[PDB]
Amino acid sequence: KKASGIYYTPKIIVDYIVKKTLKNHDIIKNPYPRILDISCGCGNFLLEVYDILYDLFEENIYELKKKYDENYWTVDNIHRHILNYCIYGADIDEKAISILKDSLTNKKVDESDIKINLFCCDSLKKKWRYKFDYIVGNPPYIGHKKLEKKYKKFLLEKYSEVYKDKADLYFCFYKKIIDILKQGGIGSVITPRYFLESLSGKDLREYIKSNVNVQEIVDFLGANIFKNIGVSSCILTFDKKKTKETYIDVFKIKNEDICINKFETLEELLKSSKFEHFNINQRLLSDEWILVNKDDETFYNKIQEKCKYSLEDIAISFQGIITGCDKAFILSKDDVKLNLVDDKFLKCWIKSKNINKYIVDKSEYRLIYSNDIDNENTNKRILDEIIGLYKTKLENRRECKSGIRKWYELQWGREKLFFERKKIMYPYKSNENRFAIDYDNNFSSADVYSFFIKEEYLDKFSYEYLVGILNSSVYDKYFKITAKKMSKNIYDYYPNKVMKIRIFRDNNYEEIENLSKQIISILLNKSIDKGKVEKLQIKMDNLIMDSLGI
DNA sequence: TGGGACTTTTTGA
DNA sequence: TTCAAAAAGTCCCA
Numbered sequence: 001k002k003a004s005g006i007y008y009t010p011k012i013i014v015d016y017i018v019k020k021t022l023k024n025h026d027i028i029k030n031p032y033p034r035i036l037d038i039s040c041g042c043g044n045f046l047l048e049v050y051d052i053l054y055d056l057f058e059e060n061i062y063e064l065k066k067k068y069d070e071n072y073w074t075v076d077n078i079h080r081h082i083l084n085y086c087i088y089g090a091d092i093d094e095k096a097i098s099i100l101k102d103s104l105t106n107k108k109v110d111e112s113d114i115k116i117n118l119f120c121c122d123s124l125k126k127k128w129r130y131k132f133d134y135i136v137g138n139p140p141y142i143g144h145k146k147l148e149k150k151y152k153k154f155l156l157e158k159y160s161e162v163y164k165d166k167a168d169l170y171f172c173f174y175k176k177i178i179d180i181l182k183q184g185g186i187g188s189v190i191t192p193r194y195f196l197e198s199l200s201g202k203d204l205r206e207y208i209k210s211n212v213n214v215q216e217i218v219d220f221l222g223a224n225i226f227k228n229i230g231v232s233s234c235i236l237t238f239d240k241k242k243t244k245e246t247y248i249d250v251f252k253i254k255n256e257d258i259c260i261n262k263f264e265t266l267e268e269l270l271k272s273s274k275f276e277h278f279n280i281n282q283r284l285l286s287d288e289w290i291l292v293n294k295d296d297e298t299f300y301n302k303i304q305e306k307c308k309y310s311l312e313d314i315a316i317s318f319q320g321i322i323t324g325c326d327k328a329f330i331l332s333k334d335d336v337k338l339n340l341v342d343d344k345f346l347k348c349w350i351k352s353k354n355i356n357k358y359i360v361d362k363s364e365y366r367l368i369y370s371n372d373i374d375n376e377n378t379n380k381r382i383l384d385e386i387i388g389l390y391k392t393k394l395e396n397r398r399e400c401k402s403g404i405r406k407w408y409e410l411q412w413g414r415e416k417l418f419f420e421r422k423k424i425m426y427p428y429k430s431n432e433n434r435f436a437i438d439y440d441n442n443f444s445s446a447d448v449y450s451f452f453i454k455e456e457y458l459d460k461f462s463y464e465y466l467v468g469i470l471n472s473s474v475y476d477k478y479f480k481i482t483a484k485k486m487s488k489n490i491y492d493y494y495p496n497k498v499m500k501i502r503i504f505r506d507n508n509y510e511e512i513e514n515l516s517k518q519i520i521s522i523l524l525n526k527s528i529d530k531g532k533v534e535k536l537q538i539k540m541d542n543l544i545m546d547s548l549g550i
Numbered sequence: 551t552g553g554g555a556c557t558t559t560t561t562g563a
Numbered sequence: 564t565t566c567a568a569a570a571a572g573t574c575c576c577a
């Protein structure tokens with residue numbers, strides 16, 4: 001399956017990571033460094049390590065010959081020494097190890113067979129017999145849906161310090177690498193960036209912060225590093241050195257449309273205008289890692305201090321309907337099959353794209369709220385001609401197999417009363433803040449999140465005021481500071497972060513609310529000349545900036 | 551083949 | 564009993 005050009009780490013990144021770890025190695029003082037890659041594959045990293053080592057030994061061959069055994073340190077012996085004592089690799093694929101072993105053997109190209117330290121094993125189960133000086137590589141990423149159940153139980157029992165709930169497989173590789181790193185060693189890996197902000201990575205970030213000194217983080221944000229692969233990458237470099245001060249070099253990319261396979265070295269790219277550099281004090285990291293420059297930190301801290309309320313304080317949040325099979329329960333509003341379904345069971349259905357700022361597009365789909373169907377004898381045509389077409393798939397849902405749900409019921413139908421009221425809705429993934437007031441009792445899947453204001457905060461906050469500030473440029477920038485960057489121009493808008501947004505009340509409340517009412521009034525007209533909306537938004541942003549003192 | 555529009559349901563807790 | 568998180572996303576066209 002995984003036999004193609006994908007998953008090959010680009011040469012620029014491989015070269016950077018190998019150099020970053022061995023740039024300043026004192027081969028005279030320690031001529032026996034152990035370099036490990038625990039997901040070496042065909043040896044993208046290890047073959048480069050061999051070359052870097054060979055130059056390093058050959059450049060100091062006469063100093064080694066003089067300080068140590070004169071007969072042992074010769075140029076002809078460098079190849080044997082590297083393979084015996086220096087390069088280590090591990091991979092679960094037997095064929096990959098077979099190829100890597102031949103590649104290392106053919107580096108020199110008789111005598112006694114040289115023992116190459118390659119292991120065909122599960123790196124997370126191996127009883128590692130010693131720690132390592134340097135660890136580099138590109139671990140596998142496997143999410144919570146794509147992991148096997150038996151294997152996941154093992155991770156939960158043994159890697160509980162970093163792996164729980166919706167965590168990822170590469171969380172465990174981070175723990176393994178840190179655990180088998182020598183005092184004073186250096187590790188450098190490329191992994192997905194999502195653990196820097198995700199709720200799942202909370203324990204993993206705590207593990208890294210409390211056990212290694214993070215030297216450098218390269219955040220590519222939504223840039224496409226791996227061709228034809230939908231993943232966002234970062235490079236972490238960490239050590240176990242005794243140092244008094246622990247500051248992190250953060251290199252965050254500025255333009256996501258760059259092509260990495262166009263510059264000579266990654267170092268040239270990082271020092272250029274295509275990246276920004278700033279320092280974060282590792283002691284000042286909380287459970288959240290707020291990796292922003294001084295301007296954005298000052299901006300963020302001003303808003304946090306000024307706002308006395310959060311959305312969670314004043315709102316009730318909930319995820320959308322999860323049918324478990326959308327094609328079985330969602331039909332076009334013009335589908336002739338809806339004449340078989342009583343309007344009592346029909347609900348309006350919108351997708352994330354139907355959410356704009358301040359207002360929702362008119363629904364084009366309907367949801368059959370099948371939970372309200374009492375008996376199978378009644379409304380049999382609905383069960384036999386609409387929902388039953390997917391009966392086999394519906395029966396394969398978890399709650400149907402355990403008997404909690406009937407085969408025709410919605411898997412997670414939530415509570416209708418939550419949806420059939422005035423509320424605010426936003427897409428779960430978007431390029432910008434899009435918070436709308438729903439007036440039409442719209443239902444939606446889990447690609448749209450909703451909340452409504454608690455009764456006790458209705459006098460302080462109105463729906464019109466909230467969509468005003470939340471759709472403002474100030475709050476767009478404020479949310480994206482700590483949001484979870486998913487892919488190019490996509491952020492996660494999930495309650496675990498959206499409900500942490502903080503809000504304020506001051507003298508500008510009335511004028512902000514009135515401007516929001518004007519914007520809503522314009523956006524709902526048939527002859528909508530939606531140009532004045534931009535001007536009103538600009539005026540509102542000025543009031544908000546005045547309110548927060550920025 | 552790479553870029554852009556859009557986003558299901560499986561899953562642990 | 565029933566919540567909400569999770570992109571080695573998914574899909575299509577020029």
Ligand SMILES: CC(C)N(CCCNC(=O)Nc1ccc(C(C)(C)C)cc1)C[C@H]1O[C@@H](n2ccc3c(N)ncnc32)[C@H](O)[C@@H]1O
Nearest residue numbers: 002003007039041042091092093095096122123124138140
């Ligand atoms: C494929 C991705 C996921 N890979 C990224 C690193 C480069 N991998 C790579 O070049 N693989 C490869 C390339 C070509 C071949 C062919 C010979 C052409 C068939 C075979 C394998 C991760 C490697 O980790 C290995 N892996 C996965 C789980 C896991 C674990 N639990 N313990 C230890 N090693 C683990 C897996 O076999 C991969 O080689």
Ligand SMILES: [K+]
Nearest residue numbers: 065066068070
């Ligand atoms: K000597």
Ligand SMILES: [K+]
Nearest residue numbers: 222223231232
């Ligand atoms: K990406």
